[PDB]
Amino acid sequence: EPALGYVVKVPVSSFENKKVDISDIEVITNGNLDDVPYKANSSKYNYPDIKTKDSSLQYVRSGYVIDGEHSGSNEKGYVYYKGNSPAKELPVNQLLTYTGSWDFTSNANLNNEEGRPNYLNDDYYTKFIGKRVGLVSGDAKPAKHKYTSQFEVDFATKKMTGKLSDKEKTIYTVNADIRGNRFTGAATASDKNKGKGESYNFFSADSQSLEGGFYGPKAEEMAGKFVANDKSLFAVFSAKHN
Numbered sequence: 001e002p003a004l005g006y007v008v009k010v011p012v013s014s015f016e017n018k019k020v021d022i023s024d025i026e027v028i029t030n031g032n033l034d035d036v037p038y039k040a041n042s043s044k045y046n047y048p049d050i051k052t053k054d055s056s057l058q059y060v061r062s063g064y065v066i067d068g069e070h071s072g073s074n075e076k077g078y079v080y081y082k083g084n085s086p087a088k089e090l091p092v093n094q095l096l097t098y099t100g101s102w103d104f105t106s107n108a109n110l111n112n113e114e115g116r117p118n119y120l121n122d123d124y125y126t127k128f129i130g131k132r133v134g135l136v137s138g139d140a141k142p143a144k145h146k147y148t149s150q151f152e153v154d155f156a157t158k159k160m161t162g163k164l165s166d167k168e169k170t171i172y173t174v175n176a177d178i179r180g181n182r183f184t185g186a187a188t189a190s191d192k193n194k195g196k197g198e199s200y201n202f203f204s205a206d207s208q209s210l211e212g213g214f215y216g217p218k219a220e221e222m223a224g225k226f227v228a229n230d231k232s233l234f235a236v237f238s239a240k241h242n
Contacts, residue, residue, distance in 0.1 A: 022134075159177065
């Protein structure tokens with residue numbers, strides 16, 4: 001089918017259901033990169049936070065549509081990617097490095113026992129982090145968190161490796177098998193320890209559902225997503241060579 005992209009709603013928890021996992025990954029129909037998914041819902045938000053559009057990309061977009069000032073049981077927002085012009089030619093002789101970003105939303109786990117932090121002024125804009133609603137890459141303060149993605153694509157072997165990092169720290173390593181202009185593969189959490197409180201680690205679960213495509217006539221760009229095996233995270237990404 002080649003979906004133009006995907007998007008998920010950020011999980012919202014409650015006393016009745018303290019744990020709410022990732023679910024219902026909607027497929028996007030609409031390739032217009034100036035169109036953000038669920039833009040209409042964001043009118044009501046206290047602080048409409050829609051990840052800004054990177055001027056250097058021409059065929060793909062990944063980001064988030066969220067309330068930057070959420071509270072209580074409000075809807076929080078959505079995470080998505082899209083792309084168009086699935087690649088028809090793929091560079092042959094060359095080994096290409098794609099560089100870009102990634103974004104995510106965690107699951108919601110209101111359970112005090114899980115150990116997620118309520119209050120980290122330096123780190124996030126939101127309180128009760130990942131508890132009342134999933135944590136979104138958008139809630140992080142730029143001074144302490146920057147989510148950058150870098151992939152190595154060898155079209156000869158049809159292999160992809162790469163890293164999803166947070167500033168200087170590696171968070172996931174990725175491996176994919178290229179198959180035409182799509183790809184599939186796995187993301188491996190670099191830190192498997194879940195920890196607690198300030199050091200709590202939202203990124204501890206592997207994923208066998210890494211899946212993306214190449215975009216632009218000559219695969220000048222790439223974008224995809226993946227879902228934690230335990231349904232505790234949903235990540236998207238986008239990049240461009242060289």
